[PDB]
Symmetry: D2
Subunit: 393 residues, 4 copies
């Protein structure tokens, strides 16, 4: 292992600072001072730190307090060298956001949320973040008649397009990244998956600077393939940031260390981020952000062990995924299964629909029964990836 700043491992303040309250209990750890957080994180080899406005600045802090806090915070950044690549707003903890921020049924709460957001964009630019994340965790319902579903999407669009237009208007060098989540804390959250989020951005006025911020555990809560989803975001060139962690199944969001959930899936996620696509195409070159929570049963030694482990797991997987693809036997297996064959167009240069239709060999004269005999050998190909993952090859 041994992570270093050019690896671009970013961590949020709320991850290592998460104190332990869950639905059945109180915190098991004391609050983490943000200056300690920065120093500690930098010592471990992180590249940057991210935060939610209220992570650093209390909801009711006065203007004198906000500047006191920011002064010590900027100093620590300075002393250590951590950058601040992404900033986000808390539109979910305070009781006022019980029906949402942007999609609250109450008009006065929608304006308050939007004004909280606009102000936070200002702080984002001041910090030097390139990405502004929006997780609409309270946007949704428990009951189907609680909302007008068309109006909920018009109100979501108005807040995002207002925020986007503000970025363009002030000339900030910022992008917005929406973060899909299927449920928890709402029964049903709006824009529940990568596809929903991707679809939605296409209906925006300011779509051009809006992308996604997918989270491993969030797609796994719907039973989806995390690599399939990021592949699709990447293919559309909407993968602006990423949140890595672990999830063992369809249940509450667990927020384990990356690699402590679906291990084989993390392997392939790493292969896609590092190696890209077999035939060439898009690559994700942003930060590798870890959005997790250290288990409540463990003390602060566990908090820093857990932070260390996110980075270890990613470097271990990266190493095995480079060896995997570099292997002559894998490449050969790949060729046999048709991975490079999928890269060739179906139609010949210049062939029209008409042409293919009327080409006897592709249809009328085709031997479907002979084509059906092919051994794709996907089982052997899968076996080679696991032996590579197991450190056996």
């Amino acid at each position: 292992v041994q992570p270093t700043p050019a690896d671009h491992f970013t961590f949020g303040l709320w991850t290592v600072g998460w104190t332990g309250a869950d639905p059945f209990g109180v915190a098991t750890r004391k609050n983490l001072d943000p200056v300690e957080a920065v120093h500690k994180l930098a010592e471990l080899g992180a590249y940057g730190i991210t935060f939610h406005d209220n992570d650093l600045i209390p909801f009711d802090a006065t203007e004198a307090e906000r500047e006191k806090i920011l002064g010590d915070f900027n100093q620590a950044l300075k002393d250590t060298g951590l950058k601040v690549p992404m900033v986000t707003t808390n539109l979910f903890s305070h009781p006022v956001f019980k029906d949402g921020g942007f999609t609250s049924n109450d008009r006065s709460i929608r304006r308050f949320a939007l004004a909280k957001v606009l102000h936070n964009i200002d702080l984002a630019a001041e910090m030097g973040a390139e990405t502004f994340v929006m997780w609409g965790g309270r946007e949704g319902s428990e009951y189907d008649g609680s909302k007008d579903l068309a109006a909920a999407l018009d109100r979501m669009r108005e807040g995002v397009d207002t925020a986007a237009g503000y970025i363009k208007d002030k000339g900030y060098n910022l992008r917005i990244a929406l973060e899909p989540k299927p449920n928890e804390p709402r029964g049903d959250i709006f824009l529940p998956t990568v596809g929903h989020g991707l679809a939605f951005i296409e209906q925006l006025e300011h779509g051009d600077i809006v992308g996604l911020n997918p989270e491993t555990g969030h797609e796994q809560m719907a039973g989806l393939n995390f690599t399939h989803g990021i592949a699709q975001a990447l293919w559309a060139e909407k993968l602006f940031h990423i949140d890595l962690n672990g999830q063992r199944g369809i249940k509450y969001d667990q927020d384990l260390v990356f690699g402590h959930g679906d291990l084989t899936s993390a392997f392939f996620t790493v292969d896609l981020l590092e190696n890209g696509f077999p035939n060439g195409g898009p690559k994700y070159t942003g930060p590798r952000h870890f959005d997790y929570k250290p288990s409540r049963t463990d003390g602060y030694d566990g908090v820093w062990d857990s932070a260390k482990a996110n980075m270890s797991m990613y470097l271990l997987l990266k190493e095995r995924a480079l060896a995997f693809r570099a292997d002559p036997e894998v490449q050969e297996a790949m060729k046999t299964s048709g991975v490079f064959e999928l890269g060739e167009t179906t139609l010949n240069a210049g062939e029209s629909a008409a042409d293919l239709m009327n080409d006897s060999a592709s249809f009328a004269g085709f031997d479907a029964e002979a084509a059906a005999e092919r051994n794709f050998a996907f089982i052997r190909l899968n076996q080679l990836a696991i032996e590579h993952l197991l450190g056996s090859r």
Copy 2:
């Protein structure tokens, strides 16, 4: 109840004709003659019938046979009055489609699938279908390294855009509707949910004539809100057709009668199709297609009981959903919860981001703690819908 042709209840040939083979067994029913199907369906009050090419015409039938079959089939349509509103292709049963049609790793199979599709478009136009459905049931993988995820989406796009361009080129009065499915028969299917499908259409050249064909059970297999998903398709004006059925949970696709799965969700699905949105907007005016399978334990009396029941359940729900919304007490409850309030824009006519920012009452001077006291009364509102569903009000 009593369904009648202006209700626009369509049924596929493979639903009532499904003979019973599942993974652990053989058919329990004899094959259903398609001419019987048409007559029977028409007697029950259906408006139309839909089919897959091989539902009617055998994969290896000769040209003399295809015309014999079509002749008797058109005659029955004539004798009864059923229309043929949608036609689709089978790109999944034959062993040649074991790795997909359009996204097969084998180039020769991709061409064969595409040529099967183009020919079937011709038959669609001849029949008078307005909709051409594409369910990519074999497109996906069991293993993550089996495919180049970027190349799988380029090949999906090439077949759909080739088919679309052919429709435009021949001037057919047809639309394509993609049908998302999360898994089964593949471990992971590409374009697994409504959002994924919606996102994908935005990357097409011929996007304008491409929409979706969502299926109740398919979104419920990912644990998603079926009404939330169709709301989003409708809002984007991509809801070109719909497949209704029942699903009891995250498991294999059960294909029960509509209403025999998540009852409350079917209620709200019916409310959206019939009533639309509370504040006004888009409406879905196409056919109400039932894509289900009669339980294998039951004989042919059960097949026609099951067909009858799809229509009964929809009319029962429709009736309760009209009463629900028409109710003065519901309207009042709706007002209290802010359903109409969500319909008002957040920003005042002419207000800019700048303006709202600097409006003291929406932020600096806002009383978050007082705004947080509001009783949304979503529980009472939910109670009124269930009493309406229960036939109590």
Copy 3:
């Protein structure tokens, strides 16, 4: 439908008393005085109230404090006539319980946890409660190597048999009801389903007084059929108590009002509690206890609305289910489908294995293809059930 004490509707102090804090937010409601809980629930028609030791008596309460609290609570009970049918212990909220009470890896904690249970038995006995519920919410793990699994079950057995022995020695008429849950708050909980709880009970030294407390939502979080699980608990004569609420799929425990989740399943559970088994069998006679949470979006008006909605949902389902079995057409359908035929023993009176293999009629010349022709007509029985539920019958 108006509830009366005769109905045996019981509520937990923590249910209407639930304040609104979840994983991503703080409480939205103010604490509920116990005195007012008691009076308000008696005005609604409640039969009894239930509580956790620390719902009532703070963890740190002094002796003088405890006595005051008990004096006020016992006053309220005397004033209103409310009964206290069940009492439970809180072995999950304090940080001390982070790894469990009974199956903590730390022995001093295991000792404290059992001590806390014994003291609570006394209180339970003082209050007149018939049932003692044990829900081991922190018993389990996030990671597979965290626990010696054989030793976790011995620890659990030690605790439960100690508590049972103590009851027997003290002469108390108290029975222990164990309550399964698959996950939340731990990633995996010991004894996750009705099946695992019944099995464990059979390994106990004093299992005669140990039974189950199944919860609607809990079984549904693993995707099981709650009605099938309570039917196995009844069949074994081990259904000592029941917790009713609603869940809308495999996700975090929602704790919705009974009937606000899976409706048809709710209908069928009520049918089983009220009508019993079609061919006869044991019947459930305890409290109908609601363990739910008023959504955090609702103010106190909403709390009483939700309390009310629980009993109301139950009465509406009961009316429908009594009408359903009373219907001649439904009885006809039931006989046709073989529901009464399942009640006839397979073998003949004094027929042995040997006698049966040898019966020619049963095997050697049994006409399997002719038997396979029976139309079970389960679809039509299911349509009739649904129509009774919707009150269209």
Copy 4:
């Protein structure tokens, strides 16, 4: 890693013999001759072969046919030395079994099904099998009013105790292993999890010879922790057999190769089979049986590849898991986390309930806040396990 007969790797005839038909397609491979299955598996290192009565002997086979088939199979066994450790009955493929075998609503069917079982016991005994597996795949329902649930369990009990009584009377050394599954092919199956199977066994007249046959994928289809379920089966001394395969989430049963689904869970199951419980306890000694399906995309080369991959995955996991417990650092971490402390009984030798409530140290003056400070360090133990799995340690 090269398997030897000493390993006890067993395979079902129906596993490598699975032809490829699924819900949306026909077979992709030709039928496998039994003779060749036997020889091929012996060349791979298999220990034994297992089968369903109709895997080998067709349902309609004549007497002369049966004898020929048996003569060829017994030849193969003699030639290769393969053992036949388990035999099972097919009570799910013929249409006669549409509503179940043992719990069919139709009594004549229930009689045929039991007859079919008794005859198979004889054959099982002739073959030298130790285990008789019962998987009741059609036992259950799609709809809640289809069955009298108390009567479904009595019918099940009748069948299983008749079969057990017959074994006892005949002097056969055969034990029955019941096999749970939550769903597929029925929407709900009776006795859906390890927990439900163990419970039911305790209600049996002859449960001394009745135990479990849990399957990896089956428990995971309900989202349970397979390793926790087999640990409860072991603890109760009821783990008679085991079926190993892979599942990638809550969906249709995939029947992937062991290790091709949840990897870390696979690692921990192997640890439990090979290392036993950390503080000692019963150990599993039977066949390591693989009940999987070679993906339908692969030709026969793929079939043998997959057979091989099963034993290989198992050997790789075994090597890793033996190295993991042998590691001094891992033992250190285990002691730190209290894994050995769980093994110490909570009470002192001859300490009663009364003695414990009264110990001041245990309750009255126990310092709960000081005890709550222990760092269990479960995260670091889990990181160490994963690093052993990836062979980076």
